[PDB]
Amino acid sequence: VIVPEGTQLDEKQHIVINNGAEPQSFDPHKTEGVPESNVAYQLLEGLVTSDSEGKLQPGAAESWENTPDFKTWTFHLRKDAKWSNGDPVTAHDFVFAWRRLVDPATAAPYASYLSYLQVENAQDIIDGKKKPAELGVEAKDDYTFVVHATNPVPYAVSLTTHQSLLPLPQKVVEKLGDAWVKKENYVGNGAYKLANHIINEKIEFERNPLYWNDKETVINSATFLAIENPSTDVARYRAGDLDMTSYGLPPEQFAKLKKELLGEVYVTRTLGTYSYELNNKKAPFDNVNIRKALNLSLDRNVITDKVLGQGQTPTYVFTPTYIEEGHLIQQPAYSKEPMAQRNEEAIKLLEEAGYSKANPLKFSILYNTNENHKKVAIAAASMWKANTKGLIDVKLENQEWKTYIDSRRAGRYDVARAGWHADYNQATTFGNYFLSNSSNNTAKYANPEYDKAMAESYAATDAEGRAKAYAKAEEILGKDYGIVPIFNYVNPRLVKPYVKGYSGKDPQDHIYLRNLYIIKH
């Protein structure tokens, strides 16, 4: 079906993809990053999934509907679908998984996701006020899963594609606990299963013959690598030892790669924002005046045009304004001032805060080991020093991905490199991040007025009303200088000419092995 008629498929159907880092975990309730989701999406499948262009398609649910108030969501599950051990996939698995997500005992980084979906009692369960069984989801019968929201969520279906809402094999997890995730124990309902895992080297996938749609799966086996540095990724690609890079390429090589690798360079415009997150509860970044100084004195065009130059676009707000219902979000006024004015304002604010050339503002930029991040941090450090005439002095601190995520979540940072990719193609995937009570909010940003602005969106009865509430939230977040937004992403990748089914058009840039195929000639 996915293969055009007549196409000469290769016999082996093996692919090697750089996944970029060692994942924290293969349990979708214990993770929050792209490396993790890329693994989970091969092994498990939720209600709805997506094609190579990011368009929604039936997953574990073959049909679904909503009540006209957008509060009741009913999903019709496939009657003959099975887990990789032969157990049936039922609505009970979904009830089980979604309860486990908000269960405080799970301590899930994405606990808040069912709060974002406005599911009855989700927030109360997260807050320890109600038992997980009180969650407003139910198995009306073995193949009918119903979601009950307290507010209208017209974008509900798009949320259900996220890794945090993947089903888990209840019978297995209830018996094994957290140990279900070990390779010997793992059971899933996705297109692949784990053949091997060597920490810091590779993850090997093999076909799950019990996947409901195995007959349309083409790739037989795949390897995910964990290569942190884009230049190493490119080197392995050019040695013919991997087939698809991760979504970073070395800026200084980019031009020549386009010239030499005709039709192998893909650049996807994605719903993503690259920021420096400020720790709003750690001195001195609890001071709005300093957060403001850092924003004024960072020239985004230097990073996008001079350091990277691959199509990244400067931004000064968190939400990408091209996301659906994002269109009324405004770039802040200072972004239109000349750098000379901005820098003069920044220097005043830092002097008022008691910094000088002799006693500069000192802090570290925490980032995950990646030469491209290092380059951006070097440029940021350099701009902040020069633009403030010596009143900021910035050190770099790189940590392995797992450690970096831990450090951010633990608040053990001053300023951290941060990228947020949309979980679903609607503005709240960004706006929800900065709610006071969001499990994703590692900035420790909290403004009741922000929360109130966001809450007004559920009182709106149309897209315009929602888009106005999102604009007001972003305004509030901007006046607080809660973070330092830098750019909206592109995702440059190399893909070999014999790899088919990668579009360059998926705004979330997922790679599902079930969407790919290797051609012969």
Binding site: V34, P35, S37, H162, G272, H421
Partner: peptide, 4 residues
């Protein structure tokens, strides 16, 4: 999702 947090981007690598």
């Amino acid at each position: 999702a947090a981007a690598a």
